[PDB]
Structure formats: structure tokens, C-alpha cells
Amino acid sequence: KTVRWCAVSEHEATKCQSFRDHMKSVIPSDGPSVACVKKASYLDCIRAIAANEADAVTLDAGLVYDAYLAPNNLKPVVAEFYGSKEDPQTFYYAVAVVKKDSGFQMNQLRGKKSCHTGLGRSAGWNIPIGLLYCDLPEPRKPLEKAVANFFSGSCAPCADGTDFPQLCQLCPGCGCSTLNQYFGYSGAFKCLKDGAGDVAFVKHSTIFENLANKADRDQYELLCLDNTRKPVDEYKDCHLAQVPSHTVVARSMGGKEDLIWELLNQAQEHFGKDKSKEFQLFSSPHGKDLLFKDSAHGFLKVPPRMDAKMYLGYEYVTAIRNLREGTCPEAPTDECKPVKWCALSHHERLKCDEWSVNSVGKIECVSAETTEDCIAKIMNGEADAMSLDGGFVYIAGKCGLVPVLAENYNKSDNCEDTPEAGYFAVAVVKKSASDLTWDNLKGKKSCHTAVGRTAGWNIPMGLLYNKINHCRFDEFFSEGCAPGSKKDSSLCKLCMGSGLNLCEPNNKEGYYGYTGAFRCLVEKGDVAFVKHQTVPQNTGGKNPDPWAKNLNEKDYELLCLDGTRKPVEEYANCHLARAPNHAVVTRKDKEACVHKILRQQQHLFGSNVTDCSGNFCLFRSETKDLLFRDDTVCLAKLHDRNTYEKYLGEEYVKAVGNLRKCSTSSLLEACTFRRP
Ligand SMILES: [N]
Ligand SMILES: [N]
Ligand SMILES: [N]
Ligand SMILES: [N]
Ligand SMILES: [Pt+2]
Ligand SMILES: [Pt+2]
């Protein structure tokens, strides 16, 4: 129950010691305790932790990566934050600030002028140059020389002036102090403001510190990695790297990440920001930034599924990977690299394998355990593309993936050129009960296609989450039929299945499915949740079943969102959400290549191929819906609809968003930590 904290100096050990003493008093025997193991460097601390000699140490982003690498394999567990609970700011963003309409992008930096905070600074030097690595001329070592040949002129504080003079061009001498007017953050900025340099590699917050006026800031933009610009205000969407300010790391396995959190949670409570004046956790008596940066306002728990690569982000792990590995390709600059497709079943792998060979190597395959694991691989570039349901397009979206292609199910000559946007989720109710509107749903009887089903459970409960604001959905409706709910709940009370199939989500339920929930409606229901065309196909003598024969369209009215009721054929206007198609999801950088390859592939192996027994086709599975849903005819392009928020309905998002409050995703909780 003793967390062995690691000290890198004698000063740190002292603070650790008092931190052992003060936590000793305020904590009962049944509580966390601190040990003080004293090594000589952060590296030594990393090796100590991994060798199970220490338990936790807090590191700068650079060492967070070092800790991740074999054989240490250490992971972020706790984060320092630098604001409030509502404004944590555990991360920063290395950016590239430029003049407005200076007329160039990230891939057009060769032969420009640059302003750096200082050589060896992360945001100012390491991150930019790291990204820029493959564009530098040979030889790239020494790094100073290659960057000198890259930019026409530069201000690189602390750079070797005598040897590589072009790095001092903007600030001769390359003064490594505030003497140099172009040194530091504000200095790297006024290097740009004075028009001496074309681009300044600073922090997202730098611009705000120098120019107080919203007016002046408007003549400045940011270079985004996708070779677009954006306002200085949208840094979270236009940064070169998101960097964790301070992070505690422990062993990936048996690290005691709970012991650590338990300790630091109580430590920040008793001795946190101002909450004591006998001992300050974030105040160093003999020095500054002992154990923790004095900036720190408190701690946050890092979600469990977070690995270092995920925490740092692909951009950051690209930069340093380049600086260290220094391995650039020589593959043609124009041509697209093979797209690694993600498979999550053994058959999915087998199908992907067949595809891959027939794709003449233009498609490659990667096996992963979960769907969430696949998304993680796309994120950190262990894979390229995969298809996701609406609910996973969301999760991937909050993780900074993008929909690119949508699965089209309705045969259409020029389908490739028209996305579908799926069907319409509706809440139907008998016309007779005029009292029934969206609001007074509380306590009524209900009918669901099933629990987990899109239109029957997801959108309804997701929207009606605001009206309940807890995770006991059965307590909303007095009684209902939700096939799959606990046999004993109130959502199983209106299900007319005999025996074992009493409340099971199968055909023998009879109150299951789209038709089934409508029978639940027509007989003993106050509301049913079905698609738009469920009423038209189950009425007007289209259904020769007993209960359905003589049911008519006029008799039922679907309920709307604003409180109104509408007729069945006005579903277009009276809907809950637009339950979406499955979509191909990829990383922003691989968007172009994926659009290309998949379009070519669906020509060769698409729906347009017969004799599917003599030639491979992409849309026929051995078992069921491998890689793509079998109902697919083509993969439509998503120009204009190429974000998660723009592909999924604002409504759909609200629903799934609310639902994910009750049902947690270890991946979703991770991505939302990085981007809330
Ligand atoms: N492990
Ligand atoms: N592991
Ligand atoms: N029934
Ligand atoms: N029934
Ligand atoms: Pt493990
Ligand atoms: Pt029945």
C-alpha cells in the first residue's frame, strides 16, 4: 500500500520526504502511503519503475515516450492540469503561426523563413523539425545543417551560428537569452510580427499573450497538417502536435495505477491548490518544480485504455520518431501507399486476405481483437481503413477519425455520386389518444423493436435521456416490451412470448422487430419505435397475418420532436433521427488515398461483377457481412459530409452521445480526455 515515488535530485527527495510525513498524518492506516526512492536521473527513475524498484514518476512528454519504449513499457496514469476543473488544460498545442494570406501551406515551407523559440525546445524546434524531417535535404545530420539548407533564412536561438549561419539570418548571433529580441515565445512571435520570418513555431497560447486585441490577431492564421489554414482561434483543429504538459507513468502491467491515483487524489485534496498552508504539493521550498510543476492546479485520472502512443498522439510520436529513427522512405512522392485494412474476425481476416492478393497488393490486412482495437490502430497508424456502424463512426469521430465513403444499399445507376443518409427513426402512436405528445411520455406503455436496436431503443432513449437524466430507463415507462431486457423488468411485461421466448429478442417473441413492435402498438401499446416504412407495409392489407389484416394507415400518427403529431407519410418532417449507413472510416491524412483505392477496387470486385464463384467480389461474405455489409452495392463519396458531426445527424449524435453516458466505452472515455 506504499507507492514508491521516484526523486531525481536531493531537493526532490526532501520534498518527497515531507510529502511522506504530511500524508502520514492526515491518512488513516487504511489509506495510501508514500515511499521515497532516490535515483540520479529521469532515465534511472524509468528503469527503476520498470524493474519494480519504484512505482511512479512524473515526466515531460519527451520522457513519457522514452518510458513507453521497450523494455520499460510504462504508461500515463495521472495528469497535471493548469487551470480549473472546467478548464484543466493538461495539454498544450505546438502550432505554426503565419501572416494572413501569406499564401503557402505546411508542404510549402521549403525556402521560407522561420522563427523558432529556441533550438532543442519541443514546441519551437523538436516538434516542427521532427515533422519536417523527410523534406530536409541530404545529409540531414547534423540537423542544424539540414534545416539551414531547408529554410532560406531563420532565427534559431542557441543554434551554432559560426558553423551554420543561415539559422542566425533573422537574429544574428542567435542569442540564447532575452538579449535576443527574437528569443523565447514572445521573441519567436515578434520575429514574425516584424515580418522578418514567414512562420513562427510557438504555442497556441503564445499569440494570445502578445496581442491582447482581437483586431490584430485576425491578420494571423495557423498552418494545419492537412495543408489548410484556420483562424488563430481554432488551434485545437489546426496544431502540429498536442503535448501532455506533465504526466505520471507506471508499469503497463501491475503498475498500481489505482494506488497512485488514490494517493494523489487525497494529496491534492489535503495539500492541493491552497487547500493547506502547512505543506504545498505544488510548492517547492528548496527549489522550483519539485516532484511536480508548481504550475499544477491539480490532478486528473488518465482513462485505463490509454497507452503512451495514444496519449501523446500520432503527430507527436511522428516528430520524435523521425528525430530519433531518422528513416525516410524513397517510395514515389505522388503514388499512394498500400492501405492496411482492419479485420476483427478470423473470417474477416480470411476475406481480407483474398481481397489483398486480388488487389495486387494495393490492399493489405491487419488483425485486431476488438472494433475499438481496430479504431486504435487507425488512430496510431497501425492500420488505415475499416467500416463502422453509425455508433462506431461516432466513437471513431470523437477520436479524430473521419467518414470518407458510405455503404449504399439501394441499387442506383450513379450511386457512387449520391450518399443515402439511411432510413428514418420514428415514434408511432394511435391517432385516438390525442393527449399523447412527446412530453407526456412519462409513465406510458411502450413498444421497442428490441434493446440495442437502432430505431427501437437507441434514438428514443438517447433523446429521452434529458427527460430522465439517469440510467434507469425502465423507470420512465410504467410498462413496455423491450426484447432483451431483464426478464423481471417492466420492459418485459408486455411481451407475449410463450415459455423461454417470453422476452427474448428473436422471432418467437412475436412482439420483436419492426413488425412486432407495431403489433405491440396496435394491440396493447401506447407508443412504438419503428422506422418510417413500418406503418405502410404493415397496414392497408399488405400484411395477411391475423392481427394485421384490417389495420389502416389513417389510424396511426407518428409523434414529432417539437411536441406536434404528424401523418405517416410526413416522416420526412416528423422524425427522431436519420439512422445512418455504415461508413468507411480513416485518418485525416490517408483520406485522399483511401478515396482513390477503394473506388478503383469496387470497380473490379464491386456489385457490378457476376460469376462471383469464378472471380472475387468484395461484397459477398463466406459467412455474414465480412468487412462490408452484404447489402452494399457501391461506396459513395462523402464530399461535404466528411466529418462525424456532418455524416451523423446532430440528432443522432445527441442520442448516441447521451446513451454513451450510461454505456461506457474505454476508448471513448480516452479520446474525450484528450479532446473534451
Ligand atoms: N503484463
Ligand atoms: N501485457
Ligand atoms: N398478443
Ligand atoms: N397476437
Ligand atoms: Pt499485461
Ligand atoms: Pt399474441
Tab-separated table of N, CA, C and O in Angstrom, residues 165-271:
chain	number	residue	atom	x	y	z
A	165	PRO	N	25.366	29.586	-40.594
A	165	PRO	CA	24.963	30.980	-40.380
A	165	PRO	C	23.526	31.374	-40.718
A	165	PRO	O	23.015	32.352	-40.177
A	166	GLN	N	22.886	30.600	-41.605
A	166	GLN	CA	21.569	30.932	-42.129
A	166	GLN	C	20.517	30.813	-41.030
A	166	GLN	O	19.411	31.331	-41.171
A	167	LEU	N	20.872	30.121	-39.941
A	167	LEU	CA	19.972	29.935	-38.814
A	167	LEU	C	19.960	31.187	-37.940
A	167	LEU	O	19.111	31.321	-37.062
A	168	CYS	N	20.906	32.100	-38.191
A	168	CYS	CA	21.009	33.338	-37.434
A	168	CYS	C	20.556	34.524	-38.281
A	168	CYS	O	20.513	35.649	-37.792
A	169	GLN	N	20.198	34.256	-39.543
A	169	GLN	CA	19.954	35.290	-40.539
A	169	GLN	C	19.014	36.369	-40.001
A	169	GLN	O	19.226	37.553	-40.257
A	170	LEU	N	17.986	35.950	-39.253
A	170	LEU	CA	16.949	36.846	-38.764
A	170	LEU	C	17.357	37.461	-37.428
A	170	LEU	O	16.942	38.573	-37.107
A	171	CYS	N	18.152	36.715	-36.652
A	171	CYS	CA	18.651	37.174	-35.365
A	171	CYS	C	20.138	36.839	-35.257
A	171	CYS	O	20.505	35.831	-34.653
A	172	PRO	N	21.036	37.661	-35.853
A	172	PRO	CA	22.460	37.327	-35.930
A	172	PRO	C	23.070	37.111	-34.549
A	172	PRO	O	22.789	37.862	-33.617
A	173	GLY	N	23.891	36.062	-34.437
A	173	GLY	CA	24.484	35.667	-33.170
A	173	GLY	C	23.690	34.541	-32.512
A	173	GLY	O	24.252	33.745	-31.762
A	174	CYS	N	22.384	34.498	-32.810
A	174	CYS	CA	21.458	33.503	-32.286
A	174	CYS	C	21.498	33.506	-30.759
A	174	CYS	O	21.586	32.450	-30.134
A	175	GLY	N	21.432	34.713	-30.184
A	175	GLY	CA	21.461	34.914	-28.744
A	175	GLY	C	20.509	33.957	-28.032
A	175	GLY	O	19.342	33.847	-28.400
A	176	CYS	N	21.036	33.266	-27.016
A	176	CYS	CA	20.301	32.231	-26.310
A	176	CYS	C	19.718	32.808	-25.020
A	176	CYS	O	19.547	32.093	-24.033
A	177	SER	N	19.398	34.108	-25.052
A	177	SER	CA	18.834	34.816	-23.912
A	177	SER	C	17.882	35.910	-24.392
A	177	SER	O	17.738	36.130	-25.593
A	178	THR	N	17.250	36.600	-23.434
A	178	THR	CA	16.243	37.614	-23.715
A	178	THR	C	16.890	38.853	-24.337
A	178	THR	O	16.185	39.715	-24.859
A	179	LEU	N	18.227	38.937	-24.255
A	179	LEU	CA	19.018	39.870	-25.043
A	179	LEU	C	18.514	39.857	-26.483
A	179	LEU	O	18.105	40.889	-27.012
A	180	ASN	N	18.564	38.666	-27.094
A	180	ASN	CA	17.993	38.408	-28.405
A	180	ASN	C	16.499	38.715	-28.344
A	180	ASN	O	15.772	38.132	-27.541
A	181	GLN	N	16.064	39.655	-29.192
A	181	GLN	CA	14.690	40.131	-29.223
A	181	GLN	C	13.784	39.070	-29.844
A	181	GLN	O	12.564	39.133	-29.697
A	182	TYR	N	14.398	38.106	-30.538
A	182	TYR	CA	13.675	37.074	-31.261
A	182	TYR	C	13.828	35.730	-30.548
A	182	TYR	O	13.670	34.675	-31.164
A	183	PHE	N	14.119	35.784	-29.242
A	183	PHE	CA	14.322	34.597	-28.427
A	183	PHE	C	13.071	34.324	-27.598
A	183	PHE	O	12.369	35.250	-27.198
A	184	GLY	N	12.824	33.037	-27.324
A	184	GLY	CA	11.719	32.619	-26.477
A	184	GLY	C	10.415	32.547	-27.264
A	184	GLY	O	10.430	32.401	-28.484
A	185	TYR	N	9.292	32.661	-26.549
A	185	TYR	CA	7.980	32.554	-27.166
A	185	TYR	C	7.592	33.888	-27.801
A	185	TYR	O	7.355	33.949	-29.007
A	186	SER	N	7.544	34.946	-26.984
A	186	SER	CA	7.199	36.277	-27.457
A	186	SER	C	8.189	36.731	-28.527
A	186	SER	O	7.822	37.467	-29.442
A	187	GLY	N	9.440	36.274	-28.399
A	187	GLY	CA	10.513	36.634	-29.310
A	187	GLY	C	10.346	35.973	-30.676
A	187	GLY	O	10.510	36.625	-31.705
A	188	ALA	N	10.022	34.675	-30.665
A	188	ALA	CA	9.772	33.929	-31.887
A	188	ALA	C	8.581	34.530	-32.628
A	188	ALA	O	8.475	34.401	-33.846
A	189	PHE	N	7.698	35.200	-31.878
A	189	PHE	CA	6.484	35.772	-32.439
A	189	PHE	C	6.782	37.123	-33.084
A	189	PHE	O	6.344	37.381	-34.203
A	190	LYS	N	7.508	37.989	-32.366
A	190	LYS	CA	7.823	39.314	-32.874
A	190	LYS	C	8.867	39.194	-33.986
A	190	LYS	O	9.215	40.181	-34.629
A	191	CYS	N	9.344	37.964	-34.209
A	191	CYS	CA	10.160	37.623	-35.363
A	191	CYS	C	9.276	37.578	-36.607
A	191	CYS	O	9.732	37.871	-37.711
A	192	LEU	N	8.008	37.204	-36.400
A	192	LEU	CA	7.015	37.106	-37.456
A	192	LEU	C	6.299	38.447	-37.610
A	192	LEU	O	6.046	38.884	-38.730
A	193	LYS	N	5.984	39.084	-36.474
A	193	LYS	CA	5.258	40.345	-36.442
A	193	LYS	C	6.049	41.420	-37.186
A	193	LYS	O	5.461	42.276	-37.845
A	194	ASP	N	7.382	41.359	-37.077
A	194	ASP	CA	8.263	42.317	-37.726
A	194	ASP	C	8.487	41.922	-39.186
A	194	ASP	O	9.197	42.614	-39.914
A	195	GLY	N	7.877	40.802	-39.598
A	195	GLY	CA	7.884	40.364	-40.986
A	195	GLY	C	9.252	39.846	-41.423
A	195	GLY	O	9.499	39.682	-42.617
A	196	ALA	N	10.129	39.596	-40.442
A	196	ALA	CA	11.462	39.075	-40.693
A	196	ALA	C	11.376	37.604	-41.094
A	196	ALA	O	12.150	37.142	-41.930
A	197	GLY	N	10.418	36.890	-40.488
A	197	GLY	CA	10.194	35.478	-40.753
A	197	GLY	C	8.779	35.217	-41.263
A	197	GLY	O	7.855	35.968	-40.953
A	198	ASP	N	8.632	34.131	-42.034
A	198	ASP	CA	7.381	33.787	-42.691
A	198	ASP	C	6.487	32.991	-41.744
A	198	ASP	O	5.263	33.061	-41.844
A	199	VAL	N	7.112	32.230	-40.837
A	199	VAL	CA	6.390	31.329	-39.952
A	199	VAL	C	7.086	31.282	-38.592
A	199	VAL	O	8.314	31.309	-38.513
A	200	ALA	N	6.277	31.213	-37.528
A	200	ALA	CA	6.774	31.135	-36.164
A	200	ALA	C	6.196	29.901	-35.477
A	200	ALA	O	4.979	29.756	-35.374
A	201	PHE	N	7.089	29.017	-35.016
A	201	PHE	CA	6.693	27.796	-34.338
A	201	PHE	C	6.626	28.079	-32.842
A	201	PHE	O	7.649	28.128	-32.163
A	202	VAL	N	5.400	28.282	-32.353
A	202	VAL	CA	5.170	28.668	-30.973
A	202	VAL	C	4.042	27.809	-30.410
A	202	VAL	O	3.733	26.749	-30.953
A	203	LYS	N	3.443	28.281	-29.313
A	203	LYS	CA	2.347	27.583	-28.668
A	203	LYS	C	1.037	28.257	-29.067
A	203	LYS	O	1.038	29.388	-29.554
A	204	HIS	N	-0.072	27.537	-28.869
A	204	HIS	CA	-1.404	28.016	-29.199
A	204	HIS	C	-1.730	29.259	-28.373
A	204	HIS	O	-2.524	30.096	-28.797
A	205	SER	N	-1.100	29.358	-27.196
A	205	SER	CA	-1.383	30.416	-26.241
A	205	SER	C	-0.457	31.613	-26.454
A	205	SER	O	-0.692	32.675	-25.881
A	206	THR	N	0.581	31.442	-27.284
A	206	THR	CA	1.589	32.474	-27.488
A	206	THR	C	0.946	33.727	-28.079
A	206	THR	O	1.151	34.827	-27.568
A	207	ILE	N	0.165	33.537	-29.151
A	207	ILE	CA	-0.464	34.615	-29.901
A	207	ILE	C	-1.334	35.468	-28.974
A	207	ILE	O	-1.378	36.689	-29.116
A	208	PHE	N	-2.001	34.813	-28.016
A	208	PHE	CA	-2.952	35.458	-27.124
A	208	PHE	C	-2.225	36.317	-26.092
A	208	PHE	O	-2.796	37.273	-25.571
A	209	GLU	N	-0.967	35.964	-25.804
A	209	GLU	CA	-0.191	36.616	-24.761
A	209	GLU	C	0.438	37.900	-25.300
A	209	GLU	O	0.650	38.850	-24.549
A	210	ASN	N	0.719	37.916	-26.608
A	210	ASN	CA	1.417	39.019	-27.248
A	210	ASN	C	0.422	40.083	-27.706
A	210	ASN	O	0.607	41.265	-27.425
A	211	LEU	N	-0.627	39.648	-28.417
A	211	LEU	CA	-1.638	40.552	-28.944
A	211	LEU	C	-2.917	40.413	-28.122
A	211	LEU	O	-3.584	39.380	-28.175
A	212	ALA	N	-3.248	41.471	-27.373
A	212	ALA	CA	-4.399	41.474	-26.486
A	212	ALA	C	-5.679	41.752	-27.271
A	212	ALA	O	-6.773	41.422	-26.815
A	213	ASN	N	-5.523	42.353	-28.456
A	213	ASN	CA	-6.642	42.837	-29.249
A	213	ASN	C	-7.046	41.775	-30.268
A	213	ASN	O	-6.194	41.222	-30.961
A	214	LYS	N	-8.358	41.515	-30.346
A	214	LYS	CA	-8.928	40.565	-31.288
A	214	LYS	C	-8.674	41.053	-32.713
A	214	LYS	O	-8.656	40.260	-33.651
A	215	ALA	N	-8.455	42.367	-32.850
A	215	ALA	CA	-8.277	43.024	-34.135
A	215	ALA	C	-7.016	42.518	-34.835
A	215	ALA	O	-7.089	42.032	-35.962
A	216	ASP	N	-5.873	42.629	-34.147
A	216	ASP	CA	-4.564	42.368	-34.728
A	216	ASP	C	-4.398	40.880	-35.038
A	216	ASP	O	-3.761	40.521	-36.027
A	217	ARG	N	-4.987	40.032	-34.184
A	217	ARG	CA	-4.836	38.586	-34.261
A	217	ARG	C	-5.453	38.052	-35.553
A	217	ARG	O	-5.137	36.943	-35.978
A	218	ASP	N	-6.319	38.863	-36.173
A	218	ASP	CA	-7.098	38.444	-37.328
A	218	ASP	C	-6.257	38.498	-38.602
A	218	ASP	O	-6.696	38.021	-39.647
A	219	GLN	N	-5.050	39.072	-38.508
A	219	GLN	CA	-4.129	39.092	-39.635
A	219	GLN	C	-3.152	37.922	-39.522
A	219	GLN	O	-2.119	37.909	-40.189
A	220	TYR	N	-3.498	36.942	-38.680
A	220	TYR	CA	-2.662	35.773	-38.464
A	220	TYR	C	-3.510	34.508	-38.574
A	220	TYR	O	-4.649	34.473	-38.111
A	221	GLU	N	-2.931	33.479	-39.205
A	221	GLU	CA	-3.557	32.176	-39.358
A	221	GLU	C	-2.612	31.096	-38.836
A	221	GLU	O	-1.483	31.388	-38.447
A	222	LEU	N	-3.098	29.850	-38.835
A	222	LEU	CA	-2.319	28.692	-38.425
A	222	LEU	C	-2.194	27.721	-39.596
A	222	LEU	O	-3.140	27.546	-40.359
A	223	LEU	N	-1.018	27.095	-39.719
A	223	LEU	CA	-0.797	26.051	-40.707
A	223	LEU	C	-1.270	24.723	-40.125
A	223	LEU	O	-0.793	24.301	-39.073
A	224	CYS	N	-2.226	24.083	-40.812
A	224	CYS	CA	-2.725	22.778	-40.407
A	224	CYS	C	-1.986	21.703	-41.202
A	224	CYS	O	-1.481	21.976	-42.290
A	225	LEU	N	-1.945	20.484	-40.649
A	225	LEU	CA	-1.158	19.392	-41.205
A	225	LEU	C	-1.726	18.938	-42.548
A	225	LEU	O	-1.003	18.361	-43.359
A	226	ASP	N	-3.017	19.215	-42.770
A	226	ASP	CA	-3.724	18.786	-43.968
A	226	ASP	C	-3.503	19.784	-45.103
A	226	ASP	O	-4.133	19.676	-46.154
A	227	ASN	N	-2.615	20.760	-44.870
A	227	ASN	CA	-2.276	21.781	-45.848
A	227	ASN	C	-3.472	22.707	-46.059
A	227	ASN	O	-3.759	23.112	-47.184
A	228	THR	N	-4.177	23.013	-44.964
A	228	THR	CA	-5.124	24.117	-44.946
A	228	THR	C	-4.681	25.116	-43.879
A	228	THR	O	-3.756	24.846	-43.116
A	229	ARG	N	-5.343	26.276	-43.858
A	229	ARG	CA	-5.161	27.250	-42.796
A	229	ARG	C	-6.432	27.300	-41.954
A	229	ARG	O	-7.420	26.650	-42.289
A	230	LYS	N	-6.376	28.064	-40.856
A	230	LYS	CA	-7.505	28.306	-39.972
A	230	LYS	C	-7.216	29.551	-39.137
A	230	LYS	O	-6.067	29.984	-39.056
A	231	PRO	N	-8.241	30.176	-38.507
A	231	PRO	CA	-8.009	31.261	-37.548
A	231	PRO	C	-7.186	30.810	-36.343
A	231	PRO	O	-7.188	29.633	-35.987
A	232	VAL	N	-6.496	31.774	-35.721
A	232	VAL	CA	-5.657	31.539	-34.556
A	232	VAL	C	-6.514	31.015	-33.403
A	232	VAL	O	-5.983	30.569	-32.388
A	233	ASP	N	-7.839	31.071	-33.581
A	233	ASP	CA	-8.793	30.733	-32.536
A	233	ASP	C	-9.136	29.245	-32.575
A	233	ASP	O	-9.605	28.698	-31.579
A	234	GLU	N	-8.900	28.604	-33.727
A	234	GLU	CA	-9.201	27.191	-33.907
A	234	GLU	C	-7.905	26.381	-33.881
A	234	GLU	O	-7.592	25.676	-34.839
A	235	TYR	N	-7.163	26.482	-32.772
A	235	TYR	CA	-5.871	25.825	-32.656
A	235	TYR	C	-6.063	24.326	-32.422
A	235	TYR	O	-5.232	23.526	-32.846
A	236	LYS	N	-7.168	23.965	-31.755
A	236	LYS	CA	-7.453	22.582	-31.401
A	236	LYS	C	-7.724	21.760	-32.660
A	236	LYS	O	-7.785	20.534	-32.597
A	237	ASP	N	-7.875	22.451	-33.794
A	237	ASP	CA	-8.209	21.811	-35.055
A	237	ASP	C	-7.113	22.082	-36.083
A	237	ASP	O	-7.230	21.664	-37.234
A	238	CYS	N	-6.049	22.770	-35.654
A	238	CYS	CA	-5.003	23.195	-36.569
A	238	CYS	C	-3.675	23.333	-35.831
A	238	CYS	O	-3.074	24.406	-35.817
A	239	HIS	N	-3.220	22.226	-35.234
A	239	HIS	CA	-1.974	22.212	-34.484
A	239	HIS	C	-1.053	21.133	-35.043
A	239	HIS	O	-1.518	20.171	-35.651
A	240	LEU	N	0.251	21.302	-34.794
A	240	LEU	CA	1.278	20.396	-35.280
A	240	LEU	C	1.449	19.225	-34.315
A	240	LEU	O	1.908	18.160	-34.725
A	241	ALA	N	1.087	19.439	-33.043
A	241	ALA	CA	1.144	18.401	-32.023
A	241	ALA	C	0.420	18.848	-30.757
A	241	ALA	O	0.519	20.005	-30.357
A	242	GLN	N	-0.300	17.901	-30.143
A	242	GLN	CA	-0.878	18.064	-28.818
A	242	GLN	C	0.013	17.338	-27.815
A	242	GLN	O	0.228	16.133	-27.932
A	243	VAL	N	0.521	18.090	-26.830
A	243	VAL	CA	1.606	17.634	-25.976
A	243	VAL	C	1.152	17.647	-24.516
A	243	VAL	O	0.739	18.686	-24.006
A	244	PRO	N	1.225	16.498	-23.803
A	244	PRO	CA	0.890	16.452	-22.378
A	244	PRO	C	1.927	17.184	-21.531
A	244	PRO	O	3.116	16.868	-21.587
A	245	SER	N	1.451	18.160	-20.749
A	245	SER	CA	2.310	19.092	-20.037
A	245	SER	C	3.144	18.355	-18.991
A	245	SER	O	4.369	18.462	-18.989
A	246	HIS	N	2.466	17.606	-18.113
A	246	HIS	CA	3.132	16.782	-17.117
A	246	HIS	C	2.284	15.532	-16.895
A	246	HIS	O	1.058	15.617	-16.841
A	247	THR	N	2.951	14.376	-16.781
A	247	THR	CA	2.261	13.095	-16.754
A	247	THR	C	3.012	12.113	-15.859
A	247	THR	O	4.232	11.989	-15.948
A	248	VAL	N	2.255	11.411	-15.009
A	248	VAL	CA	2.779	10.361	-14.149
A	248	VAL	C	2.687	9.037	-14.904
A	248	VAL	O	1.661	8.740	-15.512
A	249	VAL	N	3.771	8.251	-14.858
A	249	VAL	CA	3.823	6.971	-15.550
A	249	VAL	C	4.153	5.859	-14.556
A	249	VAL	O	4.951	6.046	-13.639
A	250	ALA	N	3.514	4.701	-14.766
A	250	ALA	CA	3.781	3.480	-14.023
A	250	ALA	C	3.858	2.311	-15.005
A	250	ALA	O	3.617	2.493	-16.197
A	251	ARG	N	4.189	1.119	-14.492
A	251	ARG	CA	4.292	-0.083	-15.307
A	251	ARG	C	2.963	-0.346	-16.009
A	251	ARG	O	1.900	-0.161	-15.419
A	252	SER	N	3.048	-0.784	-17.272
A	252	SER	CA	1.883	-1.066	-18.096
A	252	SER	C	1.025	-2.147	-17.443
A	252	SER	O	-0.201	-2.091	-17.515
A	253	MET	N	1.689	-3.126	-16.817
A	253	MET	CA	1.013	-4.155	-16.046
A	253	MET	C	1.530	-4.120	-14.612
A	253	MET	O	2.719	-3.902	-14.385
A	254	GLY	N	0.620	-4.365	-13.660
A	254	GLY	CA	0.938	-4.370	-12.241
A	254	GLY	C	1.684	-3.100	-11.840
A	254	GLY	O	2.731	-3.169	-11.198
A	255	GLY	N	1.129	-1.951	-12.241
A	255	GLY	CA	1.770	-0.659	-12.058
A	255	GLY	C	1.255	0.063	-10.816
A	255	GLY	O	1.897	0.995	-10.333
A	256	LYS	N	0.093	-0.384	-10.317
A	256	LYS	CA	-0.566	0.178	-9.146
A	256	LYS	C	-1.166	1.542	-9.486
A	256	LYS	O	-1.209	2.431	-8.638
A	257	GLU	N	-1.668	1.675	-10.721
A	257	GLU	CA	-2.208	2.927	-11.232
A	257	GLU	C	-3.426	3.367	-10.418
A	257	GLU	O	-3.879	4.503	-10.549
A	258	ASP	N	-3.947	2.461	-9.583
A	258	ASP	CA	-5.054	2.785	-8.699
A	258	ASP	C	-4.513	3.346	-7.384
A	258	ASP	O	-5.025	4.347	-6.886
A	259	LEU	N	-3.470	2.699	-6.844
A	259	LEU	CA	-2.780	3.172	-5.653
A	259	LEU	C	-2.294	4.602	-5.868
A	259	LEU	O	-2.449	5.447	-4.989
A	260	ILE	N	-1.701	4.845	-7.044
A	260	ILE	CA	-1.145	6.143	-7.390
A	260	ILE	C	-2.262	7.185	-7.421
A	260	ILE	O	-2.134	8.236	-6.796
A	261	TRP	N	-3.359	6.878	-8.129
A	261	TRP	CA	-4.472	7.811	-8.235
A	261	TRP	C	-5.070	8.081	-6.858
A	261	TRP	O	-5.390	9.223	-6.538
A	262	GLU	N	-5.217	7.016	-6.059
A	262	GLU	CA	-5.804	7.110	-4.731
A	262	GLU	C	-4.996	8.092	-3.886
A	262	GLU	O	-5.568	8.936	-3.200
A	263	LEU	N	-3.666	7.972	-3.961
A	263	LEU	CA	-2.754	8.789	-3.178
A	263	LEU	C	-2.859	10.245	-3.624
A	263	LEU	O	-3.100	11.126	-2.801
A	264	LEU	N	-2.684	10.475	-4.931
A	264	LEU	CA	-2.562	11.810	-5.496
A	264	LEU	C	-3.895	12.554	-5.442
A	264	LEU	O	-3.913	13.784	-5.450
A	265	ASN	N	-5.000	11.802	-5.385
A	265	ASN	CA	-6.325	12.389	-5.257
A	265	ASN	C	-6.481	12.976	-3.855
A	265	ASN	O	-6.989	14.084	-3.700
A	266	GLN	N	-6.029	12.222	-2.845
A	266	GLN	CA	-6.129	12.641	-1.457
A	266	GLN	C	-5.073	13.703	-1.153
A	266	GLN	O	-5.284	14.557	-0.296
A	267	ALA	N	-3.946	13.641	-1.874
A	267	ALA	CA	-2.836	14.563	-1.679
A	267	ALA	C	-3.202	15.954	-2.188
A	267	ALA	O	-2.804	16.956	-1.598
A	268	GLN	N	-3.963	15.997	-3.288
A	268	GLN	CA	-4.366	17.249	-3.908
A	268	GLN	C	-5.547	17.844	-3.144
A	268	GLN	O	-5.857	19.024	-3.293
A	269	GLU	N	-6.210	17.006	-2.339
A	269	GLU	CA	-7.367	17.427	-1.568
A	269	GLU	C	-6.889	18.120	-0.294
A	269	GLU	O	-7.380	19.193	0.050
A	270	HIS	N	-5.916	17.493	0.379
A	270	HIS	CA	-5.422	17.953	1.667
A	270	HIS	C	-4.347	19.023	1.483
A	270	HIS	O	-4.303	19.983	2.249
A	271	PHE	N	-3.485	18.849	0.473
A	271	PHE	CA	-2.334	19.721	0.297
A	271	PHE	C	-2.301	20.303	-1.114
A	271	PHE	O	-1.239	20.697	-1.593
